[PDB]
């Protein structure tokens, strides 16, 4: 019945082609195939005024790829995006983040970093907020399908987690996470300087090229992983203290 539309938070380096993606489903029992969707960008992020950028048609799997015209390409900043289904005026929302080349970022694996509605680990929000206030782009990744974005984002907003680029899976979640982060590093030209998560994430970060100094993992240390990461045995609050007195 009710629409369950999702639009991908898109991060892109300046000057580079800007491409927005979305998927449009109802109830994903129903797939919105072959329907016109209008793409809006709030080019003045605090104005509340939407600008129609163009229109695209969803494919057989309800997906949408919309290219931002070069004449309308957005400068460095974060811009709200809304994709409206013309047929019933339902919509999805996501942010377009345009960054300067070599922008430094921090990755958090949502379930493995933040959970213990699941309860939130103590001091997690403050660590993320610390990284953002220190000048780092926040990137949230999760193995969950974007079908659940509506629930995930809400959770993130409930605990007042800082605004960041949120990325969701379709398949193997680890290959997707690894390759996605790789695409951030090579095609978006981000400088990922630290990765957070649970033990299963170590491999992923290792695949990115992150050193064990830069890989923070929750829960007491595990011997197989011994030289592959830093364990946050004492918790996020303690970790925050150890960040604040510089350790990174
Ligand atoms: Ca969650």
From Swiss-Prot:
Domain of life where this protein originates: Eukaryota
Subcellular localization: Cytoplasm; Golgi apparatus, Golgi stack membrane; Endoplasmic reticulum membrane; Lipid droplet
Record PTM: Phosphorylated on multiple sites by CDK1 at the onset of mitosis. Phosphorylation facilitates dissociation from the Golgi complex and is required for interaction with PLK1. Phosphorylated on threonine residues upon treatment with oleic acid.
Expression by tissue: Detected at high levels in brain, and at lower levels in lung, kidney, spleen and liver (at protein level). Ubiquitous. Highly expressed in embryonic retina and the central nervous system.
Family: Belongs to the PtdIns transfer protein family. PI transfer class IIA subfamily.
Function: Catalyzes the transfer of phosphatidylinositol (PI) between membranes. Binds PI. Also binds phosphatidylcholine (PC) and phosphatidic acid (PA) with the binding affinity order of PI > PA > PC. Regulates RHOA activity, and plays a role in cytoskeleton remodeling. Necessary for normal completion of cytokinesis. Plays a role in maintaining normal diacylglycerol levels in the Golgi apparatus. Necessary for maintaining the normal structure of the endoplasmic reticulum and the Golgi apparatus. Required for protein export from the endoplasmic reticulum and the Golgi. Binds calcium ions.
Subunit description: Interacts with PTK2B via its C-terminus. Interacts with RHOA. Has higher affinity for the inactive, GDP-bound form of RHOA. The CDK1-phosphorylated form interacts with PLK1. Interacts with VAPB and PIK4CA.
The name this protein goes by in its record: Membrane-associated phosphatidylinositol transfer protein 1
Protein's gene: Pitpnm1
Covered residues, full protein: 915 to 1174 of 1243
